[PDB]
């Protein structure tokens, strides 16, 4: 039970860190009025 809890904690922390990194990399484009996100960076970070 301890090992399972630790594994889930590690997975959740890693996923949260990728989510935060994607947010930081993509959010400036969401503020610019022009909002011309490169399609390549949209591919990697799943940008609408």
């Amino acid at each position: 039970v301890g090992m399972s809890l630790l594994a889930l904690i590690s997975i959740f922390a890693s996923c949260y860190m990728l989510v935060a990194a994607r947010s930081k990399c993509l959010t400036p484009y969401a503020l610019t009025p022009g909002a011309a996100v490169p399609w390549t960076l949209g591919i990697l970070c799943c940008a609408p």
């Binding site: 969401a30 503020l31 009025p33 022009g34």
Partner: protein, 162 residues
């Protein structure tokens, strides 16, 4: 003379005040399908049609913005991404962009009107005010201004929120 009237006509229905408990505490500008406003000013805009939006806050730039409903997208400003040395317009007099800095005379410019934007000679929004750095007789401004691609914040040392 004419440019002042033009700039005021552009922002006649381009500025929404964000009241708190019935009192004016700031504003919000409409440009490029983005309802951008400072992320520090507290309260809610009067417009209920604009109250039901989900902003994307950012502590780094002090800038939270949303999308503009298609109903009033016609009443939106225009934007520019170049700042040659010269003269720029404001709701309280005129501003100068000297050495990468937005400058106003002291006294003019007081807290509570932070959200309102800055126009140019052609009549397009060039930057959004956040605060100023009071010093001597010319008050240097802490501004959020977008370059051609990113949103950039320029803040002089020792500036305080409006």
């Amino acid at each position: 003379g004419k440019r002042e009237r033009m700039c005021m006509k552009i922002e006649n229905d381009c500025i929404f005040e964000v009241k708190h408990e019935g009192k004016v505490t700031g504003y919000a500008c409409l440009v490029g399908d983005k309802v951008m406003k400072p992320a520090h000013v507290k309260g809610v805009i009067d417009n209920a049609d604009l109250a039901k939006l989900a902003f994307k806050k950012s502590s780094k730039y002090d800038l939270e913005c949303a999308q503009i409903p298609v109903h009033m997208r016609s009443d939106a400003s225009k934007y520019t991404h170049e700042k040659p040395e010269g003269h720029y317009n404001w709701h309280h007099g005129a501003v100068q962009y000297s050495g990468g800095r937005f400058t106003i005379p002291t006294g003019a410019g007081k807290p509570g009107d932070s959200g309102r934007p800055i126009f140019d000679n052609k009549g397009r929004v060039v930057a959004i005010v956040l605060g100023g750095a009071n010093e001597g007789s010319r008050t240097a401004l802490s501004v959020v201004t977008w370059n051609k691609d990113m949103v950039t914040r320029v803040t002089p040392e020792g500036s305080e929120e409006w």
